[PDB]
Amino acid sequence: PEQRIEKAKGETAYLPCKFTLSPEDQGPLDIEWLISPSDNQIVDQVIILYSGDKIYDNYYPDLKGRVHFTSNDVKSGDASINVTNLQLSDIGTYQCKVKKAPGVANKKFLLTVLVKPSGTRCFVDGNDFKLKCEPKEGSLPLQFEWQKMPTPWLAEMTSPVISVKNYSCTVQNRVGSDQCMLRLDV
Numbered sequence: 701p702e703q704r705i706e707k708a709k710g711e712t713a714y715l716p717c718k719f720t721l722s723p724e725d726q727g728p729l730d731i732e733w734l735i736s737p738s739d740n741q742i743v744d745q746v747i748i749l750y751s752g753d754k755i756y757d758n759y760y761p762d763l764k765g766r767v768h769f770t771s772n773d774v775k776s777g778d779a780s781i782n783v784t785n786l787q788l789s790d791i792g793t794y795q796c797k798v799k800k801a802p803g804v805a806n807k808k809f810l811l812t813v814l815v816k817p818s819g820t821r822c823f824v825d826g827n828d829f830k831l832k833c834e835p836k837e838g839s840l841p842l843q844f845e846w847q848k849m850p851t852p853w854l855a856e857m858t859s860p861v862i863s864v865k866n867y868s869c870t871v872q873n874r875v876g877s878d879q880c881m882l883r884l885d886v
Contacts, residue, residue, distance in 0.1 A: 702793065702808030702809060702810045703807075704810045705811050705812065706812045706814065707813055708813075708815070708816055708876075709787065709788070709814070709815045709816060711786050712783060712786065713786055713790075713811060714780070715783070715794055715796070715809050717778075717779040717781070717796035717798070718779065718780060719777050719778070719779060721800060724803060725800040725801070725802065725803035726800070727800050727802065727803075728752075728800065729750070729753075729775055729799075729800045730750065730800065731748075731749065731796075731798055731799075732797045733747050733748045733767075733781060733796060733797070734746055734794070734795045735794060736794070737791075739792060745760055746760070747759065747763050748768075748781060750769070750779070753775070763790075767781060767783050769781050769782075779798055781796075783811075786813050787813065788815065788837075790811065791813050792811055793810055793811070794809035795807065796809070814839050814875050815839050817835050817839070817871045817872065817876050818835075818837065818838070819836050819878075820833055820835035820836070820878055820880045821833075821834050821835075821880070822869055822880040822881060827864075827865075827886075828864075828865055829864035830863050831846075831882065833869040833880060835860075835871055838871070839873055840873070841873065842871060842873050843871070843872045844860045844871055844872075845868070846858075846869050846870075847867065847868040847870075848867050848868075867882065867883075868881060869882065
């Protein structure tokens, strides 16, 4: 299958693509990395290309300055790349295409970018109150834990909404945490 790579935001993805040439393989060496945004199967885009023994980072303006061949000597049999400063737009399918006539190889990489929860707002709206711990950005499944010892709220301790009628909010997933504070008055 297509190797599955899961990373956090703002960092660098390492995609391995090492190759061994065979004696037949005498044509011009040529490498071409393609990104497939949201995996739409009608179109891919070139991010980085190797040709005439000259590199090109010339395209996909979104990735301008953010993608590089790890290796020094790519011809030596190493086409691996690094993707730097990972964002949510970088999600997609990544493909490694090596061609040296008549030989040819291909590797599929399925990239996934999760977000450590941060930027949560804590706000209030014998009344019909609602206390709220609304995060963004983040990613599910999220967990919430509110503190201070309120008895009729104890059940809501975990839900992100304290629908109140008649001090913290800790927010956690499996890639990061977060802390937020609120005030109320009756």
